[PDB]
């Protein structure tokens, strides 16, 4: 059940989202209830209804619009409609675009009288700093001509314009002051109105902000605009002949399950080629303890996995990389840990009604014989939990805890527990101890939104140059105050809806994209994990099967504003399906190297450094028919557009710039094809 609430109010009038309240009725068996679908998270974690009475209840606030919900009860991922509504909206997945999940339908109906439609509220998507500059957004529909505005002593015009559905998203962008005082102008039906502090009358009065109040930053951090590398260190090299273990998989294609052997001096080795590549982050996948080649069940957050090598082998990568001015990220599980965690046997020993117990989401305490048999498998000197496999229960039965979809080795921790906080930053200091420069949350939209304030807040506070990026499915405009960043999994699919599944038209996509970029502060679109690929899904290349289009997504990728990534391999033209065949080895032979494709990467690198613009800048999207993609993105004085085209037809171009960013030197672009143009070389 839901029931739309009303607005939130600003200063004396303005309306800001619509309160929506969810109810359900709670199920006496039940231990938790979450709130899933594309507002919250479609794995269940980062909302949950509250009890009272014999109902689940939470309040959230939402932008119009048409979006799928519903509510999972524990560990039952299959039934999840909401029994009150009837309605269905089925919805493509992030991951996987082509499958649908039926979810219940929850709409918000925009408002009849079009004066409704005109927002800014207090909220750092609306107003922020950047630059030492101010970032100032006014929601209006089309029936309001371009408003201005009003500032203490002069009036503005909006600098750009962002379509998102029928509304415009109208920015300014204005210099630094103390205090800040502004209103908006407009004209409706031949009338002459204000946007003020008490909404839309006659004679608003001026909004007020005091600068030391809005959010952001003058100079860019590091992670606000950095281009990444994921690595997958099990696939990546050897470097190290003691380093190997009991039996390896073979680069059969078919990319088998399990251990090829890749370790930390195996990264090392490879230092060359990151750093011929350009890349200025790397991201590494689990490194630490754990049963399984990919490491995302962690035994022990404080101890590198034996086959990778000794924290010294680490230290002295982390050092090399620091020396070519190169950072490093590490994938941390905070959701879920291997059952033969110190934390976990002792909740298994103790029981219920211990502390060690509440650090966990056990469902429901199951037979004393089930327990002492696991605990023969997950306590001694070596962890023997994969073996729990072997038993038929454990194969025959779900988990007596919540667990990453019901895996046995992927033990949940318990987010309502402030001291699952305290273990994880005692586990990031030890690992800032370490020199690294950032942390990669696995399933962090599994996590409680309050956990993740939390952390994130008392990170932030500390440690303002970690990273926290987040791995997140939905739209990132959700997640933004609890993360640096978002791996951009809502861009990604928008791109595939557009250009290979082929269900959005250009204006859809400019809305996707737009539905994102315009709620969000500007430091923080800057900021987001913009890839086309990673570990949990086909490499792009086998999707595309088309060089030119391939290109072109990489392109957009260095366009579109954020931080754009390369999976390790893709640089090459490594191929392979879905998971494992997605982690093929890579090729270090350079005649089986996609090299067109490299050099490309390369280039479009390179422009990110030169061109302040592309890293960080300002950006606007426009269709100039025709599927000419039209972006612009500029910061201060340097000036740089891309002109796409974003089908097999190729199209006559006409047409400030008259220099090549692309190609250097200084019209009609082929199918698939793209100019970059400056006024000249980018400079500083």
Not at 99 to 111: G, R, T
Not at 638 to 658: A, M
């Amino acid at each position: 059940m839901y029931k739309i609430i009303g607005r939130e109010i600003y200063g004396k009038g303005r309306k800001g989202r619509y309160i929506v309240k969810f109810t359900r009725h709670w199920p006496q068996y039940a231990k938790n209830i979450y709130l899933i679908g594309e507002f919250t998270s479609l794995y269940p974690g980062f909302v949950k209804l509250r009890k009272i009475e014999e109902q689940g209840i939470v309040y959230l606030k939402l932008w119009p619009g048409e979006y799928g919900y519903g509510f999972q009860i524990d560990n039952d991922f299959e039934n999840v409609l909401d029994p009150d509504n009837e309605e269905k909206k089925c919805v493509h997945t992030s991951f996987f675009p082509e499958y649908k999940k039926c979810l219940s339908k929850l709409v918000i109906k925009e408002p009849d009288n079009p004066l409704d439609k005109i927002i800014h509220i207090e909220e750092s998507g609306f107003i922020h700093k950047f630059n030492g500059e101010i970032i100032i957004r006014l929601i209006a529909p089309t029936e309001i001509n371009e408003p201005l505005i009003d500032l203490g002593n002069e009036i503005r015009e909006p600098l750009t314009k962002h379509v998102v559905g029928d509304n415009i998203v109208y920015q300014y962008i204005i210099p630094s002051r103390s205090i800040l005082r502004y209103r908006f102008i407009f004209n409706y039906n031949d009338k002459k109105l204000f946007y003020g502090d008490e909404g839309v009358s006659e004679n608003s009065s001026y909004i007020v902000v005091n600068s030391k109040y809005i959010p952001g930053v003058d100079k860019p951090r590091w992670y606000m605009g950095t281009v990444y590398y994921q690595i997958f260190i099990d696939s990546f090299d050897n470097g190290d002949p003691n380093n190997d273990p009991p039996n390896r998989i073979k680069k059969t294609v078919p990319r088998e399950y399990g251990y090829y052997g890749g370790d930390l001096a195996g990264i090392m080795k490879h230092i060359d080629h990151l750093e011929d590549l350009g890349v200025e982050t790397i991201y590494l996948t689990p490194i630490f303890s754990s049963t399984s080649y990919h490491r995302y069940d962690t035994i022990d957050y404080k101890s590198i996995d034996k086959y990778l090598g000794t924290m010294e082998d680490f230290e002295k990568l982390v050092q090399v990389l620091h020396s070519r001015k190169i950072k490093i990220v590490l994938d941390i599980t905070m959701h879920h840990t291997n059952p033969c965690n110190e934390l976990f046997v002792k909740a298994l020993r103790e029981g219920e009604n211990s502390p060690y117990w509440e650090m966990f989401s056990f469902l429901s305490p199951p037979p004393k014989e089930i327990v002492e048999l696991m605990l023969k498998y997950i306590d001694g000197e070596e962890c023997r939990s994969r073996e729990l496999y072997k038993l038929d229960y454990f194969r025959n039965n779900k988990p007596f805890y919540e667990a990453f979809f019901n895996i046995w080795l992927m033990a949940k921790f318990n987010h309502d527990n402030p001291r699952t906080v305290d273990y994880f930053i005692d586990i990031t200091k030890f690992w800032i101890d370490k020199g690294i420069d950032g942390f990669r949350i696995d399933v962090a939209m599994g996590i409680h939104y309050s956990w993740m304030k939390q952390y994130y807040e008392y990170i932030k506070n500390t440690y303002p140059d970690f990273l926290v990026l987040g791995e997140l499915a939905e739209n990132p405009r959700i997640y933004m105050d609890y993360f640096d960043s978002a791996m951009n999994y809502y861009l990604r699919k928008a791109i595939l809806e557009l250009l290979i599944y082929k269900r959005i038209d250009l204006n859809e996509f400019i809305s996707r994209i737009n539905n994102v970029y315009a709620y969000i502060p500007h430091y923080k679109a800057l900021s987001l994990y913009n890839m086309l690929g990673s570990h949990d899904v086909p490499r792009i290349k086998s999707m595309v099967q088309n060089n030119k289009l391939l290109k072109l997504m990489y392109v957009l990728i260095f366009a579109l504003p954020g931080s754009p990534v390369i999976y390790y391999g893709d640089e090459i033209g490594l191929e392979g399906g879905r998971d494992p065949d997605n982690r093929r080895p890579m090729i270090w032979d350079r005649g089986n190297w996609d090299l067109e494709l490299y050099e490309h990467i390369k280039k479009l690198i390179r422009i990110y450094k030169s061109c302040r613009s592309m890293r960080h800048g300002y950006f606007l999207v426009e269709n100039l028919g025709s599927n000419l993609l039209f972006i612009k993105r500029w910061i201060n004085n340097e000036e740089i557009i891309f002109l796409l085209n974003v089908s097999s037809k190729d199209i006559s171009v006409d047409l400030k710039y008259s220099f090549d960013i692309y190609n250097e030197k200084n019209v009609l672009l082929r199918g698939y094809g793209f100019l970059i143009l400056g006024s000249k070389p980018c400079n500083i």
